[PDB]
Structure prediction request, 1800 residues.
Amino acid sequence: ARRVAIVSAAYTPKPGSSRVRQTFKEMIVESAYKALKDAKMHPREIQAVAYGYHGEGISEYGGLGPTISDALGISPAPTFMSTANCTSSSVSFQMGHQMVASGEYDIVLCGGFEKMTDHFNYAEYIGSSTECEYDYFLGISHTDAFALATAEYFQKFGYAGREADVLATFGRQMRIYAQNTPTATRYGQPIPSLEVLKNSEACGSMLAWGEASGCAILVAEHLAHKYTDKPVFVRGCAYTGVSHYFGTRFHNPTLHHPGLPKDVGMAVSANSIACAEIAYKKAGITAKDIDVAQVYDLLGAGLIQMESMGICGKGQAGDFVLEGGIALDGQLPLNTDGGNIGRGHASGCDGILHITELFRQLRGESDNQVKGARIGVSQNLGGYAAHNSVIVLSND
Amino acid sequence: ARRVAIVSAAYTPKPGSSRVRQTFKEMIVESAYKALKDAKMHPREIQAVAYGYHGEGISEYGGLGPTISDALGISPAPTFMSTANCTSSSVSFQMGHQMVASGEYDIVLCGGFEKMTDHFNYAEYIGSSTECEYDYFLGISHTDAFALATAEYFQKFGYAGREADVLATFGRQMRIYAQNTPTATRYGQPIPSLEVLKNSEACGSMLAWGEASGCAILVAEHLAHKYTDKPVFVRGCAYTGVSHYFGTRFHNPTLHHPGLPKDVGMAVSANSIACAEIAYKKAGITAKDIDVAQVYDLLGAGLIQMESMGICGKGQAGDFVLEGGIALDGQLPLNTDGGNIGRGHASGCDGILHITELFRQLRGESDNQVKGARIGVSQNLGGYAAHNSVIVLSND
Amino acid sequence: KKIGIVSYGAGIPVCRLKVQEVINVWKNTDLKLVEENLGVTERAVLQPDEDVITLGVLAAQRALDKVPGHQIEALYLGTCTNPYDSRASASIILEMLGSGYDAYCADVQFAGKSGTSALQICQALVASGMTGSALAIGADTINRNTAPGDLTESYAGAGAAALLIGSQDVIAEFDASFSCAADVADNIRPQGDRYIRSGMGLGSDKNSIGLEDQTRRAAEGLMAKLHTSPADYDYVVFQQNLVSTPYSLAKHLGFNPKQVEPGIYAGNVGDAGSASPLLGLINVLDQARPGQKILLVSYGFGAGSDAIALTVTDAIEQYQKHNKPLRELLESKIYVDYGTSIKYEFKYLRADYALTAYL
Amino acid sequence: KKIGIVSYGAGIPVCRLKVQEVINVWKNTDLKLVEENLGVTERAVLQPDEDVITLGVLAAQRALDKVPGHQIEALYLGTCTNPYDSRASASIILEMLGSGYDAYCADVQFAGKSGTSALQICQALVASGMTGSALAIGADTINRNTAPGDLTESYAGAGAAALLIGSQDVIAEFDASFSCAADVADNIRPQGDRYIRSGMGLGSDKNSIGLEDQTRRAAEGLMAKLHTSPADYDYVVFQQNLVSTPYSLAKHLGFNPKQVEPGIYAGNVGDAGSASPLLGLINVLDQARPGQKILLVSYGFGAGSDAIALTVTDAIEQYQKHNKPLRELLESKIYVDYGTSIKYEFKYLRADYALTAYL
Amino acid sequence: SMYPEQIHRMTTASMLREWREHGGKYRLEGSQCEECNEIFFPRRTVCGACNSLSVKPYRCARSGKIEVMAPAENPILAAMGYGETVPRIMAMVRLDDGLVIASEIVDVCDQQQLKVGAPVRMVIRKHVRESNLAWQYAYKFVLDI
Amino acid sequence: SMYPEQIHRMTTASMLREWREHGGKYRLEGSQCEECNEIFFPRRTVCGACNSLSVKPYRCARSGKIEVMAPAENPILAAMGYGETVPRIMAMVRLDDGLVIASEIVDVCDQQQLKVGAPVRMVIRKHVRESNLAWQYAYKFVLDI
Ligand SMILES: [Zn+2]
Ligand SMILES: [Zn+2]
Prediction:
């Protein structure tokens, strides 16, 4: 085993906005060649690619690897594809880490994309990545799962009367982080009042959904100095999988992870807890050590992940947010780029969206910098936490 | 870097036949638990899975990893998916090799499946894994590419008047190998005469297409003795990618591999040549060293791959076959299970179909045994050799 | 006195279309497959003035002509290609037959087993004492409801068969029956659709989960009830959408070719749906001998199967004395070309509103 | 041991549309005529996720819930608004009920008398000894198959009723029946047409040649067979497309209002076709007493009539002890406006091919 | 309609898909392990608790309570076949045997009875039509009071 | 038709897909590199030879020869929208600029002229209709003699 360094990371700016004038190939090339330039690297130095997307149903292009190797101009270098909901990039990052760590490839480009506008109405396609015969084909969506998860969280942890306050405070902090982040969709927008947000859609906690491609370039430690002065190291990763079926969140004997909480469900994501514990053990850290983090934000999902990840205790994430805990001067700064609400969301790119901001934080280059950041963590999920990824990065 | 051993390999028998009474989950479980039993291994010893299929368009099930981890009963252990035409299993094998070799996982299940009958007419769906806007949407299929490749081969290497003889001799040898192989679709069928084959569909070189799942279990060298007396080692692999567009076979400046032949096309697969050369360099072998092989057979594709792989010179594979070169007493025994024509083909499973017969050969357990086999090679392709995989296995 | 079949009749269109005429246009299947493996060389073409009612009343009137002055007590019409989707075509046939209005009457639908289901209903009505007799009809215009360019087009036909059930001068005693069913959407026709549709690709995979499963289940069910096996039957009759189908099912259930052959009629007709098992039975009874044992097992897509066991009586010899067999009826034919067949069956896409015949 | 009804069930849509909502839009009939003379103030609206199968399986499951562990031996679905024109919806319901596959099974069609015809078939199957029991269903979505702007629109409804026939714990013995039929095209629905059509203008002239003729013929037929007259019956049940119809037929055949009233349910439902006579019967049995005599006479356009005579048994008291009556079921309702009813019943002329839900 | 030129469609379902799931979707059949008696929905081949292949069909309890509920009113997220009924009341239903089912509540006659903990029962309803033209039927829930 | 209930369909194409490819499909436009002048079909963003992003549209030669040809007659492999014409003559066409195009030969008036090396020219034809209902147009080839 040998260490793997991130030497550059980049994505097509404003990922909560669409790029209807580009093809998916053009969009992939943009971020890839931007990252190559940032790293002072030639495309033909890339020995392999790991790339993610939702699936072939959007653009009707399957078996996409060779198509990407040709688009980037790296043939015969292979592209290994990943098809894993909003965790596609997170998974492809882990695949690239394995490719370099194995010794089989020294320089690997990891990434992902999503071109939702190629489909007439992407919103109704997404359900195809679930337990389809018992949810998709009955008209049950991922968004239904998040609405229900949020309702369970608030009803069972005693937040009645403050639901709007919690969601609006969260969405407002995301907007505050996005305002001064040039790659964010809400860059430069004025900050609405807490009251305006409470009276708006989803009390201000609805994400901004668009199109983006992104990538990070991974290199074996001994080569990293050729491409950067300030390498960011991969400490440890975990990827975990449970049934897509939402009912199983409440009763899943198939999930073998000892010492889980007694009572699990949608508000308490067992798969996410297991994922975080595995990841931290591999990385040689605990939650105490985390200086800055990224989570998949949407409604109350940020709260559920804050708890699963170990940042605060069961039912306490709402109060943590209300007390200013995720602000830049707070106990744990979170989604410092604006997250899915402020920066934006493009399914297959989201993993890299997280990793890029953590990469920047760990080199002192973030627009909302956490002074003296040593450890950064990406918590990402796919489906209703059917996929879960936890990635731990450090700077020494 | 540390060595990786195959401790067991298995697939659902008669892969050129369909299993309409099973779901894809049931079918996956069958081969997985068979392989686990062969290895004297418990499912909960599996630390990760790498699994392949064509894509979400067949069964309308996407983001399949978690669904497989739940079906096998291994949660939270992750399943990394692969979507790469007929090379999906070959690619997933290479992914598992990286997972073990990295040190991140010690025991990994590699495999793939295809449930074509979930789609009303799979034959017209397959084209979705090509350069879709310029082939699929114009009604141009992969089968058209193979028909054209075969026509180019015969017209340009002087086989006029013997096309039927070459294809029929090939298909007959496949039927001979399948006759005494219990897992083959043509197990126990009487061998038709060369003349009967010439007057039949595709002069006897049409494949048998059905449904199957399959897998191999990979383990770090130091653990392999717990599960088998006779481990089969992975010497080296290569996976390569060029444009899916058939026109690019004739003119592809994007393909950077030095010392290719001057004249490339469909009859001379540049991507496949490059793949074989890379693989052999990694494995520390040359074509001379190969004792037994597997190729994707269909029409004249077996000939083109025999040449790309380095077994015989440009234009000589037809004569090699006519002179008995791929028979069990021949210079290079090939597709000793019957291949796609005799044993059968199920896209996403094909990589494991190759690997299982090579695994058996290298332990002395094949039904058509190559005495003293030390080196075995899988040459597999996806699309018209847009994907290409070469996997080299040994027994010491 | 035992209850069963007293008389029968058949109605078949005279127009014929050679399989090659369809294959020359569509080039969507092999001529050799259809002629040699499936066993069909030509198929019945429905004329513009023919339908389920025209064929049904022809068959029924031919059965009732055997029993002068018969007053009808029940009439059931088994069909999946009904001219009406509300109101009973059976009452139209009753009116035409002109032999009484005081009858139990309805249309019965379960695809290709509609005719055998009607037959079971009639048997139950007589055996219960609710009537002294009952008339069952099985009829379909499969051709009319099969689309141009469909893989089954070249062997879609049409036909009708009528069986009178009673307890006087019985020629085949109804010994017992067994039925089964399930949700198996191997073929469908949604409300509105003219054309019958497949639920998957054709072949042995589709056959195994519908045709073979249900036929086997009903046949084994009935034989278990009677403590019999295939060796105990002189004749076996199956669904005859294709000449190959009875031979295939026979091989699958342990019957042999000589037990099947006398029921085969469809090489020049094609698929007559609800009529096909009843026409096979008619073809047997035309030449059978007193004492002989018949097993009849139909198949309706959807899916299900009706199995019936019969014993031929002494009265068959008198019935056969002055009888026109089905074999002879099927010699009457007029050949037409593809274009004419499409005209006759109303399969050109013409204007929804016609100004004259040709404008 | 006598044979007859053991248990029953019903299925009715909960959505309702007041008659004035339809009349305000079309202004094509008098509000007072429909509310006061015909006796219907609101009608059932079919939701987008409801149909003949959903109602049928609800009714059937409610009947089978009364007989824990019952294995189904026969299942007949009487309907003129079948979701399938080929394949039997009955086999789908059988699959759903999950109580055996080895059953006599078919769909039965003769307009509004489909349900009573299915009932007669089931009685014949049990009385013949061909089965020990049999499940009859009568169900229609008349609303779904009645056109916007049709004179009958404001009172087209939907419903399902299921009756289990057997010889153990019988609550109403089936004494005898009489059926009649003829060609009378007073209403039709040609193959393809979604909407049921009238053959002439509405009123007493149309009623005299179909509804009244056939109902009278069957009722007089059965009473002549049993040597009875209207005075001998505690209850009379007719077709109930409208509340006015049973009272009108009763006046025509010499029954009096107090014999009819206990069968009346349809003032808030409208026409439920095949279900309507069976729902009237259910409404009677919910409150009837041991010893009482019922005459049931249905009517199918096309046309024909099924008459059945029943006797209520001692077992009715136990059956009634813990029973939810139909009267109570019909209290569950959700009002919708005209626009919403048309949306729910798929009666807007939308695009042939949909891109999204709304484009 | 008037021009019968075939339109492009990547995916068309075989009848086989729904055929195999009639137990799950018409009858609410999951799975029970023969060795340890654990129950699961939906149906499966390997027991998740003990990894035994001795698994049999299990009729889930058809009565339950609303565990959690959420209206779906956003036109942007209306799926084809489900656009006509608005709102839809999505719910996680806790069955009397302990399992949880993702479904919706329909036929709400008294809105004041629609609340967390309210008792519900399974009903068979028509769902989005299949790509092979067959009608799709499956479960939903109603308030049971 | 008579029952407007929406049928399930995983995939529906946006107009954006074909909109961006009108150059490629109506006009046989690939790409040429501004730095090294290499040509490619179909169109692309990065030169494969030298990895420059300075790439411009290039009108491919619309005349060529048949390099290789193969009949498609197997009913099993008939795609929707292409079932009416049988056989179809699939070909790899070598254009006069050296590029190769995968297409088919149509309007063969003299069968004895259909052979390897035969000269061909591009024509615009109707292809399988789009899933958004727009007619699809693109290239095919005819013999040019
Ligand atoms: Zn267990
Ligand atoms: Zn260049």
Residues E 33, 35-36, 38, 47, 49-50, 52 surround zinc ion (ligand 1) (CB under 6 Å). DSSP finds 13 helices and nine strands in chain A.
